[PDB]
Amino acid sequence: EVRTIKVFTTVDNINLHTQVVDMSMTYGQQFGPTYLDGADVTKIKPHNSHEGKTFYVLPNDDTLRVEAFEYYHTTDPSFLGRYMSALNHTKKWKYPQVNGLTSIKWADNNSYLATALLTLQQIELKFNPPALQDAYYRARAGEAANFCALILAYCNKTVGELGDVRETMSYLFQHANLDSCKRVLNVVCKTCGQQQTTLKGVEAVMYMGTLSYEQFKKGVQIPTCGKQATKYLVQQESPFVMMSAPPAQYELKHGTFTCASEYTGNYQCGHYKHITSKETLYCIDGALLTKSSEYKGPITDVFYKENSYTTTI
């Protein structure tokens, strides 16, 4: 009447720790908060089928929170719980291959996640947290459920809430290795003069104003010095740039961009689709694929590939 089984506990699914569990007590009474493949089992009692299975638990000793910080690059005590709660849902999403890319069937307002996912497969990016590197590898392969859950946890967003593609990519770039990325800008006035600026990291591969890359290089008008100065790109060193602006009708031409985010609807309650440039223009809407030779639509982000740009101005 006091049976026991052997199981593994973990915080990272890479270091496993053998545990003997009393089948006469719940998991929470022995481990605290405890999860099996996302599902919360803190209040469940052991079952014969759990022998050998692996269980996530919360970092409750020093060894365990070293392993957790080293895999996730966060000390936030709630992070594991949110990741498990998210994963409990995303493991039931469907991740079809669509035009050679892993996508996500629409559920729970996950259009923005799909668009992020599709984009990440088209640009050169190296994540620092091993959790993101391993899940991304899995995602690329076709099984994105851990990756999607990790994004929600890194972003403090829950299943079913629509999020912002630009903001999500900004959170993720903040965990990617962009050290060697450099942008150089110049702002010129008719009255005042040249005021050069330099940026690095995620700020050198992002923008919030215009959706065109040529316009940025040519110049754009922006405000205290005088009135409406011009801002233009002097130098860019990075594998990609991301040009964003509030959604507006916009024409996309094959060969002149890598991919982009179409947004239809109102602020914070709309719908994203993902436009990619391959041999023709494709539109990937979760699990649905359409082709066109041209495109006119409400676009709010555009990714261009890059290596090194130097102005002639």
Ligand SMILES: Cc1ccc(N2CCN(C)CC2)cc1C(=O)NC1(c2ccc3c4c(cccc24)CC3)CC1
């Ligand atoms: C879908 C969504 C989810 C969450 C958010 N949160 C998250 C938290 N953040 C502090 C603020 C905004 C925005 C959008 C959104 O809809 N983002 C877009 C956007 C859509 C529509 C409009 C935008 C405007 C300015 C800027 C962005 C706009 C004016 C009208 C589609 C790109």
Ligand SMILES: [Zn+2]
């Ligand atoms: Zn001025």
Ligand SMILES: [Zn+2]
């Ligand atoms: Zn490149």
